[PDB]
Each structure stands twice: as C-alpha cells, then as structure tokens.
Write a protein that binds this ligand. Sequence first.
Ligand code: HEM
Ligand code: HEM
Ligand code: HEM
Ligand code: HEM
Lengths: 141, 141, 146, 145
Amino acid sequence: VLSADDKTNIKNCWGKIGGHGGEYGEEALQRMFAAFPTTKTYFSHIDVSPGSAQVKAHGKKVADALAKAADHVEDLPGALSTLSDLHAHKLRVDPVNFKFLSHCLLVTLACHHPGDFTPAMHASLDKFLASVSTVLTSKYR
Amino acid sequence: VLSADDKTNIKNCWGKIGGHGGEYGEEALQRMFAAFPTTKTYFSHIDVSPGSAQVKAHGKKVADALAKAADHVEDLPGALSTLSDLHAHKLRVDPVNFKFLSHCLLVTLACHHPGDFTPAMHASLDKFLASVSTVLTSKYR
Amino acid sequence: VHLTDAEKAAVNGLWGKVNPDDVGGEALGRLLVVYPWTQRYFDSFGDLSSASAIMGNPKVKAHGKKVINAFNDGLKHLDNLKGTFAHLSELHCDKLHVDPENFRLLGNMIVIVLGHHLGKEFTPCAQAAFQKVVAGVASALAHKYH
Amino acid sequence: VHLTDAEKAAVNGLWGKVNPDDVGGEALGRLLVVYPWTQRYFDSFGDLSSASAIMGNPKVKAHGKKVINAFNDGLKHLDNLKGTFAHLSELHCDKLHVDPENFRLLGNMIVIVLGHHLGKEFTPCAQAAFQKVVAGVASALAHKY
Ligand code: HEM
Ligand code: HEM
Ligand code: HEM
Ligand code: HEM
C-alpha cells in the first residue's frame, strides 16, 4: 500500500538512479534469464544472449516505465493501464515471473548502490515493485 | 485492482448476504480452524471449540468489516486502517493465513449461495478478498 | 498424508455422491476464470476469451476428465503420491514449466467445487480431510524441484 | 541441486571472500525489516520495533551466525541436503509452525546481501549458482509438510 515514508524513499532512489536506469533494467533482465531460465520462454522472439542489443533496448523500456511509476506513485492504476493490458490481457504473464524480476532488480540496485540500499530503503522498494506487479497482473480497463 | 464489473459484483453479493453475514463469517473461521490448524495459534486466548459463542461473536465482527469494505471498495486503505494496525502492527499475522481464511470464506459462500456463485462472481470475490488481505497485512502509518 | 479412519470414510463417502467428470470440468473452468494467466498454459484449447466461452468449451470439459482421473488414482494409492504422480510431475515441470504455485490453485478450485455441489454436507471436517489430499497431490507434482 | 564445475568454482570462490557471520546477520536483519510479520516468530529476541533496533540487536546477530552455520553445512553436503537439514525441518514445521514460503524469503535475503557485499563480482552467472543453492535449502527445510 505504501506509507508517506515509502513514497519519499521511492522518489529519492529514482532520484539517485537518474540516467543510470537503462543499465539496471538491462542487468536485471540478464540476471532473470540466468537465474530463472523459465522466464526466457516469454522472450522467444528476440536475442537473449548475455550482451544483446535487443535486451539492452528492452532494459531501457522497463526503466522508463519504472521511472514513470515513481512519478505517479499515488496513481499506479492510472499511470500503467497500457502496461496492464499488455502483461495481463495480451501476454498472460504468470505472476511468479514478476517476483523473479523484482528480486533481480533488487540484487542489481544492491550491487550498484550499496550505500543507499539500506534495510529501510529495501523494504520500500520491495513494496513498490510488489504494487507495480499487482497492477500489471490485474486486468481492468 | 478491481474493475467496474468487480465493483458491481461485490455490491450485488453483499446485498444477497445482508444479515446472513455473521453466520457465514463464523462458518469461515470454523472452516479455517479445522482445515488449517496452524491458524489456531493466533486465537490461543479464546475458546475455539466448534460450537463457541466467542467464535460466533468474532464471526459477526469479521462480517461487518467485509460489509464496510464493500461500501468503500474505492478507498479500502481509508476504511480499514484501524484493522490494518491491529493485524500488521500489533498481531503481525503471516499473510498466508489471509489466503487460508479468504479460501474458507469462498467455500462457505459456495455452500450457501450456489446459484449466485458463478465463475465470474467467484473471480470478483477472490480479487476483493486479495486486496482486502493486501491492506490488512501491509503497514503504512 | 495422515488420514484417520473417520477421515477416510468422510472422503470416499462424499466423493461417491458426486460426479467426478463434472467436478473436474468446473474446477478447471473456474481456474481459467479466477486466475486468468493460466489460460496461457492451455493454447491447445482454442479461444478462451470469456467466462461464457471457457465453460462451454468441450476441450476444457474433456481435460477436466483427465485431471480428475489422476486425482482419483491418488485416493487409491495415498501411501505413494510421489510414485503415482511421478510421470505427470515430469510432464508439468520439465516439459511445460508450470510453476508449482499453480498446482495448489487447482487444488483449491476442486475443494470449492465440492462445496458448490454438496451444499451443507461439505462440513468443516470434510473440508479438512480434502485439504490434506489436495495439498498432498499438489506437492506430489512439485516434487521434482525438489 | 545441479551445480556444474563452473557453478562449483563460482560458489566457493566467492563464498571464501565474504565474512559469513556478517552475511547471516544482515540477511536475517533485513528479513525482519522487509517482511515485518517474521518478527512474531522471534519473540525470544526482545525489542524488534524499528530498523535501527533490529539491525543493532545482538540476539539477531548471534542467530544469523547460527543460520549461516547450517547453510554452510549445505555447501559441504549438497549431495544429501534433505538428510543434512533433517532435524531443522522438523523444528521449523512442527515446533515453530513456520510457513514454507518464509524459507525462500530468507534465501533471497542471503542472495542480495552477497550482492550488497560483493558488487560487480556478484555476476549474473554467480547469482544463478547461488540461487540454485538457496532454493534447494528452502525445499529441504519445508519438505514435510
Ligand atoms: C515490473 C516489471 C516490468 C515492467 C516495468 C515491464 C514493462 C514493460 C515495457 C515498458 C514493455 C514495452 C512496452 C511496449 O512498448 O510494447 C514491456 C513488454 C514486454 N514485457 Fe514487460 N514489464 C515487467 C515485467 C515483465 C515480466 C516479469 C515479463 C515476463 C518474463 C514480461 C514480459 C514482457 C514481454 C514478453 C514484452 C513484449 C516485448 C516485445 O516483444 O516488445 N514483463 N514490458
Ligand atoms: C481476512 C479478513 C479479516 C478481517 C476482515 C478481520 C477482521 C477483524 C475484526 C473486525 C476484528 C475485531 C476488532 C476488534 O474489536 O479488536 C479482528 C480481530 C482479530 N483478528 Fe482478524 N480479520 C481478518 C483476518 C484475520 C486472520 C487471517 C487472522 C489470523 C488467523 C486474524 C486474527 C485476528 C486476531 C488474533 C484478532 C484479535 C482477537 C481478540 O483478541 O479479540 N484475522 N479481525
Ligand atoms: C493440480 C493437479 C493436476 C492434475 C491432477 C493434472 C493432471 C493432468 C494430466 C493427467 C494431464 C495429461 C493428460 C493426457 O495425457 O491426455 C495433464 C496435462 C496438462 N496439464 Fe495438468 N494437472 C494438474 C495441474 C495442472 C495445472 C494447475 C495446470 C495449469 C497451468 C496444468 C496444465 C496442464 C497442461 C498445459 C497439460 C498438457 C495440455 C495438453 O495435453 O495439450 N496442470 N494434467
Ligand atoms: C535459510 C533457511 C534457514 C536456516 C538455515 C535456519 C537455521 C536455523 C537454525 C540452525 C536454528 C537453530 C539454532 C540453534 O541450533 O540454536 C534455527 C532456529 C529458529 N529459526 Fe530458522 N532457519 C532458516 C529459516 C527460518 C526462517 C525464514 C524463520 C522465520 C520464520 C525461522 C525461524 C526460526 C526460529 C523462530 C528459531 C528458534 C530460535 C530460538 O531458539 O529462539 N527460520 N534456524
């Protein structure tokens, strides 16, 4: 649900992420493909090799979407309705995959920003991605 | 997240329930204690025997909370924040117990209102109990 | 699985006064309605566009018959679930990559369909016994993860 | 529990350059912060009402040392994980009544802490190898059930 503290924590993290977003989305996906080979099935139509221009491009798309979700925290249903139709109606993504990517995203941010990645920050980000996942696997209109 | 059809269906169900509420809430709890004995841990301080006035009274408290949540579907964190502090801050209930109770409740309704319990209704009710569960397990103040 | 003798007589008695084919069909159908992402695992079934469509679907009804036959074998061999479902455990996991969390979701769907069919005869105690079976069945298909 | 030769060399090559006691301390500490309901199971631990409190709690640090010691047994005996975690499986599921889903949560906490402590050395390949381990340890403690 996210508290007041949760929101400003989310805003500060994506503040400190800035332009580095694209690299972390990419890395998160590489980690998801490597650690959970099951998720590769959904990306059968692109090159998924470690260093892939298609994965790098998609990595940036994800980062932009997360950056937009951090702006409109108080209206996550509204901000991501298009992405909700993609993943829930069209793609029919199993929810576990989101837990896999959420986790690989938290590992990345822990590897790159260990100073700012506190226990209290980590709690906020885990909650944030969980609500982003809820909206994305949901089906409304 | 709940759609317009989900909103309509939850209203239409708690209209059919009305005063039969506490009766079903009691049966749900009674189903939970029997099918998932783990949950009896959280009720050490009350008599939990099948026939029990304390379980009967607690069922009526749960039913009214669900009725209130049905009224304020559009603002669930608002209407239930007093119960969220009880369950998340004070009792720190494991979220799996909410799935257990949600399911036992859906079993109960199917036993008493099998004409109304259509696959489409089932869906609407399951999303409802999930988002009610999310607020209650979730800690935001 | 534990199962006492009264817990045995509760399971085989109530199962005897339901139609397993109809229980299997509706449970699968309800799984496809309530948890829509599972629709992806069943591409072979044609369009699964709406609640009206996925219930009338003859290929869903026929598959619920297959799911409930496997379930029925479990009741006969509760001593060894891991061996009774070993082949299907390999199919669902190695070949289809179905996440174990889904197995318990279909387990729940079966339980509620029973109560939907049995009314006030599906007593709390009767649910408790069936809950041990469906959880046992679910974890028998997941037993390859381990 | 796969672990090929490349996955073997990655796991113990990187495990040898972290302090395991601190890994268990922080991973447990984070589990109590991120998933607050887990605090209930550790009532023998005194105060657990804030992030600053539970990270500085000695009882927590001592227990993470216990938890990582059992984890360390796993690495030595990956061949028979179900038998190594025999007693602990009984303890968590019968005496403590801990829901199995909580095991994979603590596993994930271990994983990210390694990443926190290692940075760029905790490569995608090295995560996969450690992910295979923690999932195995989780399904060795739950596996009643
Ligand atoms: C919260 C995490 C996620 C975010 C922010 C996200 C966001 C996005 C975005 C921005 C796109 C591109 C939209 C477009 O222009 O078409 C996309 C497409 C896609 N997503 Fe995700 N997604 C997430 C999780 C997942 C997961 C877990 C999977 C399953 C492994 C998945 C599978 C796909 C697929 C298959 C596409 C289509 C790719 C293409 O062919 O262009 N997504 N998502
Ligand atoms: C899922 C929907 C639930 C709702 C709507 C709900 C609602 C309520 C209500 C109305 C009360 C009484 C408030 C008061 O006057 O103190 C209460 C108390 C309580 N609930 Fe829940 N509850 C839910 C789930 C659960 C679950 C899953 C558990 C754990 C098994 C649980 C455990 C408790 C306990 C231990 C109390 C305090 C009882 C007492 O000391 O009198 N609740 N809840
Ligand atoms: C929970 C207990 C389950 C039982 C007893 C069961 C039973 C079966 C059986 C016996 C078959 C093979 C029938 C044949 O060879 O003709 C089968 C196939 C299959 N099952 Fe299940 N299953 C279960 C869970 C699930 C769940 C939850 C899913 C949803 C993801 C699933 C998805 C599939 C798929 C995709 C096939 C192959 C489809 C095809 O034949 O074209 N299974 N199942
Ligand atoms: C990574 C998987 C886990 C491992 C390896 C592990 C390890 C251990 C060990 C070795 C002990 C006994 C310490 C001793 O010998 O004195 C223990 C106790 C305990 N564990 Fe775990 N554990 C795991 C998961 C969990 C989780 C997730 C929880 C949270 C619900 C938990 C709750 C407890 C509790 C409440 C005790 C009793 C502590 C006491 O003596 O007061 N365990 N654990």
